[PDB]
């Protein structure tokens, strides 16, 4: 070049770029690459107005600066203007982002760093970890100087012994008084624990209702709303028997059980269909050990290779599969306790701010079916809707927790051969299972996956993929998928091999994971499927909700017919 001593020493980028000015071709030769030189020149351009002094240029080289829009920002900053930690950009929690990973990768988003997908005027932003704010703009300092481009309680036993006086719910609906005439009548209707109080419109729980703290709200007399509050997290596997006392040695497969069921509702308040759950009219009323898929636990010679290869008709008599007046599809998966009531999820009904195209005339039900086409009178029954009630722990700004709801049908309560509820007794035999290690199964049909993720190059299967996710310790759920787990939030899974489609997530919401017990003959349910991170995405743990916290409000639902 200009100096002959330059060519005497072999090419080292320092001597051309720091000592003097390096052009495109000289920096290309010294760097032995074109894309690297282009990226270096872009980071160089980041300090076009900030090249002086040199530490400012070094700050541009490391980055951490986004003035103006910030879509080209590729730095390392977590702090927002408010100061809240940003949600993991790779993850999609705690809400549904309309900027999905398959539409706008233009942000170059990274889990630990802020980016700007929409090129916001204020700068790169992020969704807040906490549900207080929908999204917080990432306040990023300017290169070279310490200035920013844009200016900077748990409830005991789910309300059994709670004394909070909060009134506003998460969505915004005000609560009705617990002392109202309808609420006073419901006080006699629902057996309350003697050592609990209920006053005004506070989220109470006098009956041991493990739904968390919920308040009677306006509209339907008895409609329930949840005050916006945080809740703790617990673990179960760490305890051995305790007062359980069932056996001395260990045995996991090969157990038979026969017994009765203890109810939690007044028989006058629930009528027929109360003390018969957890069984099947065909398979379990005769109390006979049934075919291949349930044989996995009961067969002594078989614990890992059974593989019936099919899920014949009626294997899930207590699962619901919705239609809308839209082209035939399931909005939110659901399970059946009885023909009259369907336990749908609350996410689909009330996501948009306008709150429309989710109405009663749209939704239709069919239950206990291998495929969504075939139907007969004695298999299940269909009826119109009158009013749908939503969960006041959900909105477009909230964290989507406790996504469960119901639907008020017309024709009265009835059962069938392919219709039977599932029982939910206490933790005694659950501990027996935990210290005995028994296996279970989950059901569904596989359309909620289609609603939350899209399939390309392969049609959506109309048949449930009958593959099981066993019970795994809670931390495995916590680190496999990164959606926060509430107190009403269940977890399960297996030691996975990534890269393939979710094994039991092929299914719908509300898919009961039912699991055999040695003292009841009624296979136990532990989780109701909800919005899943690894479910709605590829090959990770599907989410459930704690059924132990979803088992007390059903009593008063049938009486509105008789009111």
């Amino acid at each position: 070049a200009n100096t002959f001593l330059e060519e005497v020493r072999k090419g080292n980028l320092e001597r051309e770029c720091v000592e003097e000015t390096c052009s495109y071709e000289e920096a290309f030769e010294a760097l032995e690459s074109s894309t690297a030189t282009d990226v270096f020149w872009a980071k160089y351009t980041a300090c076009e107005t900030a090249r002086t002094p040199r530490d400012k240029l070094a700050a541009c080289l490391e980055g951490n600066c986004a003035e103006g829009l910030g879509t080209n920002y590729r730095g390392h900053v977590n702090i927002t203007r408010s100061g809240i930690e940003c949600q993991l950009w790779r993850s999609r929690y705690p809400h549904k982002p309309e900027i999905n990973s398959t539409t706008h990768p233009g942000a170059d988003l990274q889990e630990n760093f802020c980016r700007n997908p929409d090129s916001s005027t204020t700068g790169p932003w992020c969704y807040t970890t906490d549900p207080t704010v929908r999204r917080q703009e990432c306040s990023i300092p300017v290169c070279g100087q310490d200035q920013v481009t844009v200016a900077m309680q748990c409830v005991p036993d789910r309300g059994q012994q709670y004394q909070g006086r909060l009134a506003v719910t998460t969505h915004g609906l005000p609560c009705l008084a617990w002392a109202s005439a309808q609420a006073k009548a419901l006080s006699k209707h629902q057996d309350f624990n003697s050592a609990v109080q209920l006053v005004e419109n506070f989220c109470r729980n006098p009956d041991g209702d493990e739904e968390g703290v919920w308040c009677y709200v306006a509209g339907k007399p008895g409609d329930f709303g949840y005050c916006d509050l945080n809740y703790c997290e617990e673990a179960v596997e760490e305890e051995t028997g305790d007062g359980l006392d069932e056996d001395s040695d260990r045995a996991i497969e090969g157990r038979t059980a026969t017994s009765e069921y203890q109810t939690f509702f007044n028989p006058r308040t629930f009528g027929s269909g109360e003390a018969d759950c957890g069984l099947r009219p065909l398979f379990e009323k005769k109390s006979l050990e049934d075919k291949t898929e349930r044989e996995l636990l009961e067969s002594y010679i078989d614990g890992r290779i059974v593989e019936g290869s099919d899920a014949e008709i009626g294997m899930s008599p207590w699962q619901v599969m919705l239609f809308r007046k839209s082209p035939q599809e399931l909005l939110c998966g659901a399970s059946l306790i009885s023909d009259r009531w369907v336990l749908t999820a609350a996410h689909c009904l009330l996501y948009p701010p306008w709150d429309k195209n989710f109405t009663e005339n749209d939704l239709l039900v069919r239950i206990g079916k291998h495929s969504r086409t075939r139907y007969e009178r004695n298999i299940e029954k269909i009826s119109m809707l009158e009013k749908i009630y939503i969960h006041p722990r959900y909105n477009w700004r909230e964290n989507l927790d406790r996504d469960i709801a119901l639907m008020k049908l017309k024709k009265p309560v009835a059962f069938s051969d392919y219709i039977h509820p599932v029982c939910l007794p206490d933790r005694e035999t659950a501990a027996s299972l935990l210290q005995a290690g028994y296996k279970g199964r989950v059901t569904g049909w596989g359309n909620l996956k289609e609603t939350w993720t899209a399939n390309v190059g392969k049609g959506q299967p109309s048949v449930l993929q009958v593959v099981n996710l066993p019970i795994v310790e809670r931390p495995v759920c916590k680190d496999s998928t990164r959606i926060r787990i509430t107190d009403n939030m269940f977890c399960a899974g297996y030691k996975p091999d990534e890269g393939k489609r979710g094994d039991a997530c092929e299914g719908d919401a509300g898919g009961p994971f039912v699991m055999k017990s040695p003292f009841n003959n009624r296979w136990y349910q532990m989780g109701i499927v909800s919005w899943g991170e690894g479910c709605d995405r590829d090959g990770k743990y599907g989410f459930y909700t704690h059924v132990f916290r979803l088992k007390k409000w059903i009593q008063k639902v049938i009486d509105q017919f008789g009111e």
């Binding site: 290690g437 996975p496 489609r501």
Partner: protein
């Protein structure tokens, strides 16, 4: 077949796909002769009607050599009890003659003394079948094979909450997720010796598929070689 890779065309000829009423393999099959198929006797509790589609290489579609064969009668062990975990073996005499061709060649019995002195004394063993590609992953669309090593008796005993009888032996990995799984119901697991694969056994039960600390509970073929022959000549 947790993990693993596809059987190359002809690599697993005795391996058969026991097609049930819906013609999807409810069990792993093993060609034995021109008229015989091998499966674990647990497969007898999972059947409405069933056939043997020998030569199948892909459950997605027919891709050559698929001949449908119908089981004449099952030779179930009379001492076969699920609780014993033992005699989980069902010889399937066929109505349709097995046509020895590409991907059709059985595995026959070696010397009982030599088999005991050599087969169960090997290092690793090869398992094949349209099995679950992972511990719970989807069933292998292609005919996928896998190799698993032998496990010491005491290791299997401590690794099992149940009995590890004089025959049953563990084979797999302590924590690595690779073994037979759902799809290898009676799925033929073999062992190479001078390119002649020898069926050293088939998983019966176990906690999960290649779980942590767990192994496939295989059946000692050398234990019942005399019974295997006597059931070859039975029915």
């Amino acid at each position: 077949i947790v993990g693993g890779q596809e059987c190359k065309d002809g690599e697993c000829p005795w391996q058969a796909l026991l097609i049930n009423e819906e013609n999807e393999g409810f069990c792993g099959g093993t060609i034995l002769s021109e008229f015989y198929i091998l499966t674990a006797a647990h497969c007898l509790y999972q059947a409405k009607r069933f056939k043997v589609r020998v030569g199948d290489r892909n459950t997605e579609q027919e891709e050559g050599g698929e001949a449908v064969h119908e089981v004449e009668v099952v030779i179930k062990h009379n001492r076969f009890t699920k609780e014993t975990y033992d005699f989980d073996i069902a010889v399937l005499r066929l109505k349709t003659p097995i046509t020895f061709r590409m991907n059709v060649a059985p595995a026959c019995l070696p010397e009982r003394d030599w088999a005991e002195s050599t087969l169960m004394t090997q290092k690793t063993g090869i398992v094949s079948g349209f099995g679950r590609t992972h511990e719970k992953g989807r069933q292998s669309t292609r005919l996928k094979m896998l190799e698993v090593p032998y496990v010491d008796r005491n290791s299997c005993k401590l690794s099992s909450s149940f009995i590890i009888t004089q025959n049953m032996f563990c084979a797999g990995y302590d924590t690595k997720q690779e073994d037979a799984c759902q799809g290898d119901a009676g799925g033929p697991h073999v062992t190479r010796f001078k390119d002649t694969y020898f069926v050293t056994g088939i998983v019966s039960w176990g906690e999960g598929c290649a779980r942590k600390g767990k192994y496939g509970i295989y059946t000692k073929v050398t234990a019942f070689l005399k019974w295997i022959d006597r059931s070859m000549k039975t029915r």
